[PDB]
Symmetry: D2
Subunit: 477 residues, 4 copies
């Protein structure tokens, strides 16, 4: 059953001071299922004061003790995976099998970052004067304000939170209001694991009012944001105005390059399965399919058959492989994308229409003969729609893949080492997957370039935005 969500301030789950709440609806039915507290300025003041105290206590806990507490939270998350997955499905719409995968991988993310926190190594530099010692020490930056979207309510919070806790920083996150229950369950596991009060905080309310107050507040030292590019540009400008360290993970437009020597069956299974994961509402979802003209037609038929094999329905019902879209605004965007494709002369091979009249169900869509001016090839669709366009020379495919200002993810399918070497050097993406779907592991860096933002949420590089570099030189006399 779906439960109501409160705010987490200073270790206590509390209501807002004014008592205001926001209704939460099920995307598959459109009916209310619960509500979440709507925090005001007064609640943010208490959260910011608790965040300052939490940073003081957490930075004094040794790294091996912070790792032990973090790994106990990961065990609690893994124990409660079924319950958290059910909350995620009801509020977000993804199938129960996909929700369970996200929760289990979140526990894997916590465990890796817990060990990474014990390996934040300083440096000893060979001194210019042997009578002095030159060292480079690493310290937590301080309290962190975070903002996360609804696409992966638990996974997109767990990466920011794990990196902040592993370095010794405090963490105050505004989770998405449309999917509040599963992020609250993730933070409840950390509270039960023994994270001290004030080290972690959770708020909900008006996104614009909360971000406008936390970012300029002197307590906050670091801002991290994941979401849309237009919103990220607003918050990055505000962070720059007050000289706050910031990292941005924004929307992407992932190209897929299917070379002449590609395995067509492997490309359809990998890129097709990655296309419809989370109903295409993923920042790294394969969007622009650039298929070589020699095997383009065979690729299109197989992709259409794969899309027609998906079962669309309620995510709680067994056998569902494609759930409802998270919000009605995605339904409007899907209709606009398909309508524009028809106008510009593209062909709708399958899907392209709303299923039913209740919920946010949209059929998986494959579009062929897409011109370069179509909206689907310039703006991120963020839905279950694939666009296919042919090419002759691999240099033409690379040039098209680099045309847009989005630099987040890319995909390729080829057999020769020369093609792999060329695509590694030339594609302007933060992540490249060849001959397989995306497998984002905690040990691999996760981030984009250009308008997709900057900063990494995986690997050892994920801790650098939360750390300050200090040069120390002591003359021994």
């Amino acid at each position: 059953t779906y439960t109501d969500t409160q705010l987490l301030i200073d270790g206590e789950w509390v209501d807002a001071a004014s008592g205001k709440t926001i209704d939460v609806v099920n995307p598959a039915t459109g009916k209310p299922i619960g509500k979440v507290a709507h925090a005001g300025i007064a609640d943010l003041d208490r959260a910011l004061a608790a965040a300052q105290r939490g940073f003081e206590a957490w930075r004094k806990v040794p790294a091996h003790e912070r790792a032990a507490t973090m790994r106990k939270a990961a065990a609690l998350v893994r124990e409660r995976a079924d319950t958290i997955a059910q909350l995620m499905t009801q509020e977000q719409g993804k199938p129960l099998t996909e929700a369970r995968v996200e929760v289990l991988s979140a526990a894997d993310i916590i465990e890796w970052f817990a060990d990474e926190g014990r390996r934040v190594y300083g440096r000893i530099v060979p001194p210019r004067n042997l009578g002095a010692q030159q060292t480079v020490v690493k310290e937590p930056v301080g309290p962190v304000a975070a903002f996360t979207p609804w696409n992966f309510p638990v996974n997109q919070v767990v990466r920011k939170l794990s990196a902040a806790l592993a370095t010794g920083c405090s963490f105050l996150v505004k989770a998405p209001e449309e999917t509040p229950a599963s992020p609250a369950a993730l933070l409840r596991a950390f509270v039960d694991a023994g994270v001290p009060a004030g080290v972690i905080g959770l708020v909900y309310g008006d996104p614009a009012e909360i971000s406008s107050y936390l970012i300029p507040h002197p307590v906050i030292r670091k801002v991290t944001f994941t979401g849309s590019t237009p919103v990220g540009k607003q918050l990055a400008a505000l962070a720059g105005q007050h000289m706050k360290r910031a990292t941005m993970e924004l929307g992407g437009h992932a190209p897929v390059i299917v070379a002449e020597d590609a395995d067509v069956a492997l490309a359809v299974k990998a890129a097709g399965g990655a296309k419809f994961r989370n109903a295409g509402q993923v920042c790294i979802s394969p969007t622009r399919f650039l298929v070589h003209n020699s095997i383009r037609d065979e690729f299109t038929r197989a992709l259409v058959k794969h899309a027609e094999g998906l079962k669309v329905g309620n995510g709680l019902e067994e056998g569902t492989t494609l759930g409802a879209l998270a919000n009605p605004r995605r339904l409007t965007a899907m209709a606009s994308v398909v309508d524009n494709a028809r106008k510009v002369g593209a062909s709708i091979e399958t899907g392209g229409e709303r299923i039913g009249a209740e919920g946010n169900f949209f059929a998986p869509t494959v579009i062929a003969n897409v011109p370069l001016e179509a909206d689907v090839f310039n703006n991120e669709p963020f839905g279950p729609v694939a666009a296919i366009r042919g090419f002759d020379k691999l240099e033409e495919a690379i040039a098209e893949a680099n045309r847009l200002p989005f630099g987040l993810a890319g995909y390729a399918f080829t057999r020769s080492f020369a093609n792999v070497h060329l695509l590694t050097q030339r594609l302007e993406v933060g992540m490249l997957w060849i001959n397989q779907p995306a497998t984002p592991w905690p040990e691999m860096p996760f981030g984009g370039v250009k308008d997709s933002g900057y900063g990494s949420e995986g690997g050892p590089e994920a801790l650098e935005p939360y750390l300050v570099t200090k040069s120390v030189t002591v003359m021994a006399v």
Copy 2:
């Protein structure tokens, strides 16, 4: 003799399209000595087009060949050290001996970064699937727009330029208009060393108009700024609005902690000499002298005697150890700082008045019994003035040193390991020097925290802002 300065666009030294120029005056006499080209929008268009082509060519040159070209430029800089130093002294005001030290250390900076460019190492991660290869590759971010102040016309340009060239990026810098000749001489050495046309560019003009056009331009991928905090906040907000990667080095307010067990003679020689380097117009200049009450009076007398031993005059004349201030606005700031100190009850131990009536000469000033509300203890003076305040407990000195939002540099003097360990952990600075003056080496990270900005200009960390991290996973089938 002082020469006029042109713009460097696409490998050619050219005038502005409109022919406009800006007069350059000698700070020690107030008389014109030359002029510098005033670039408009049209010249910026040619520079941006050349920067895009320069990035294409420079990124294809192997790292060992880029290092060889960089080291040849360092040899030319070292050969021309005397000529460059004379230009710096006439336009900026620092003594000829200090100018020569800056130029020679610039060549040392180039050589270190040339070797560091050959050690930009990728990573191979143990794969989750043995049939696939997981790698992390490093690539240049792209064209870089830079903005530098007049305090160190050559050194503050050479750090940004060396890091950009070592990673393979192109570099377009707006050097300060009041000190144009010595930055132009530094870039001339790189042109003579064989840097391809368009890889490096140099412009002058209206700082607001140039920054407002280069930062949002799609060609620019990375912005780096050094200067005042209020200006840095404007450019960081603009960079965030267009999602451009940015690094900021802003003003600081350096505290000095003289502990009970400190060597008083060593503290006066080290902190006093570092105070009046470049007439205190350094972002890491020791400003807030927190001296233990047991040896405060002895410290004050020795510091006053050290200040009175300085010879004030033209930087070209031999025997001068303190030159003229760089611009008349520093003269007004010095008078305002001393006047406010008198009002709040502080005592002027020495100096505190303008010397003569021609130029920008100000006497070295020592102020004692400074209250916490005085302007010198809250705002960065950026001049040859030291403020002394006593303390009893070391925890009180640490709390005062962390009170201001400036986090750039700190200084300490102590003998016990416990004091060194405590100050290393507690002081919120990017750089700490104990028992010695500041010795910024190219291998040591250089940067601040909080309102002093973010990012490092030394060590291996200096290359990270100019590099993009790409995760590559290739399934072998």
Copy 3:
């Protein structure tokens, strides 16, 4: 109750083919308590064949799966800590509290190395030709033959085994015959955790015959030995004769430097407690106490009082802080060391005689006025005896601490940063502890120099002896 010990070959606990056994006696009573299998050449043949197959399977298991199996073994070790500790006490003699600490710290060692195995990172080098890729890959060396002493039966096996398993190597260890039960219990936990058959092997018998056969065998690729220097020289020569990679951890002679400004009470508590840990039968046991003459007499009285406060008895009995020596040969060595000290003119401040007539109980001994020619100051005593000698200048203490060819551990006590910096630079030891007793953590390198051997058993450096470095350059054409 004490159990008999079998061999672990190919995943099965089996007896020797000939059925021969070796009696195990309790060091505190001298009575038999059990027996251990005595393997011959035929059993070594089966173990070597199984080791080759175990390396093939284990090297194909992904690092994250090997880490999961290793952490499950650590949980089993922690669950069975009480049972393993009782076996260790009965066969080795250390108190039950010390035995429990060793077992619990062994589980901590396994967990750190499990995570370290996932961070064995390759390198990507900037190529001289952009058309080619230069990489440095890391691979397991292969099957490993190990030899461990009786001082820490579980801890000294767990460090070699954890490093071998984390890199993907197979591991065949000859555990000490006098303490066979607790090493067998540690390896039983790895078998129960799911380590495949042949990856781990355990043998007992004649140490000379086993080492003479495993080291030259073509299956073995790496040899690791911990024990006495004379035996290590024999096995290192044999390894060199057959070009087998080898690491050696041999005996040490740890100096303690108590400076003029040292905290005398802290030095007595830290160095005195570390002296009598495991009854001084530790390779890093503080042996040569060089105490400044100004506080030498006060230090000697406090150390004598600390030694007299130890309770000597059976390790199973509660309240015992000093157990029996592990074997009768240590009793003879203790008598010889004390007798030689009396002859050379040294004074026995406390202890120096055998306690009782049954077992291997020796009183804690403090010797003062020790000359430089005494046996205790030249040969490693490996017992509960401390030797004290005075000094005037710190340079004299450093010279004495570097006189012996032993380079394993050192201790110091001082307050000034200059003394800490000087001792860090000058002391020829692999490990230095100042103002505290030894705290060997898995993340810290553990090894010696000169006659103490080479190679590290902690930190990331502990994996290098088990890894091979391969340069790969592929031209893309």
Copy 4:
């Protein structure tokens, strides 16, 4: 003109105390050209005493000053490249063009290691107790004894010497007696560059007597050897007997795998040119050509034509691409290898006989249809002879390439990423080159596995054998 060679002891070029000398002959004519001093035990005593003093002085010189001295030596080597090359050709036999390449690449090796010495970084570990500091410091091991062969008289000395000098160690090398002049010229450049007396030493004489005395001497702390496997086993056993850290670079047996999809013309040009470099007297010379049966016959014809295009003659004469073998023992080995191949049924496609009657000239030899039992396929030929054998499946080629106990180098030629990935994982070699000849750069690790020794002479790993790892933990109280 060829000059006589003296010993370098304590900064002075001196004769042996007994005055004994060893004649040096030209391999291309068999006539004497000079002589070299023959050092005895007494001269080794002076060299060892000077080495101890040289280590004391050199370890106190800062890394940036040691790098400056090293780079000045590299400039002198590059200036004197022509003179050094002429000495190398007359005494060793390789063509003048090859000798010049070796000398110029030696200067490149020095420059890389000079910069690498400034980046010997320590580590700061996150402490378990926040009141203490845990650091890992790196220090020079001490005096180093080196032994080098005649194949690359300058290059094989320069790698050991550059690594020793960059870490601060002293260096005493026994250069080969048959090629003494060019190693002496390389060390003369370091003396002229300002390396202090005793830091570098050079001796000649009886190799067995010198190695038997330097290795056990207490002054020597590290031994490094390059040469044949049987001799390396003798010196590694002696080093183990006295517990001296040792690294071994021994002979190899390089396989070449020409896959089905290989570029046959590229494989012949790359592997054929690498085969006859230095007349095949290289430890990484391609020896066992495993060519796929589909293109085996075409490969054999092209390789034969390439061998017949070589011009054999005196290395000083212009147009010579294959010089004389270095010593008459190589002539006997070449005849024995060809004779055994005829007996076992192999076919001599070209060459296989001595050219002329004066000198050590042997014709380039290509052997086809080589059985697995032939001497050329089991023992390292170390000459200008290639052996070709066909295969059907790539797994069969990999199994053959891993059959011998030699693990130094490997070569491959393929186009698919799957083949590259498979060969990288499976080939038991220290170095792998695909689609190109060997390009050993100073930044790439250089070393073997199994009977080829251990340790690396390139990359950052080349400094580890000359460094000691010290754990330091200081409790701040």
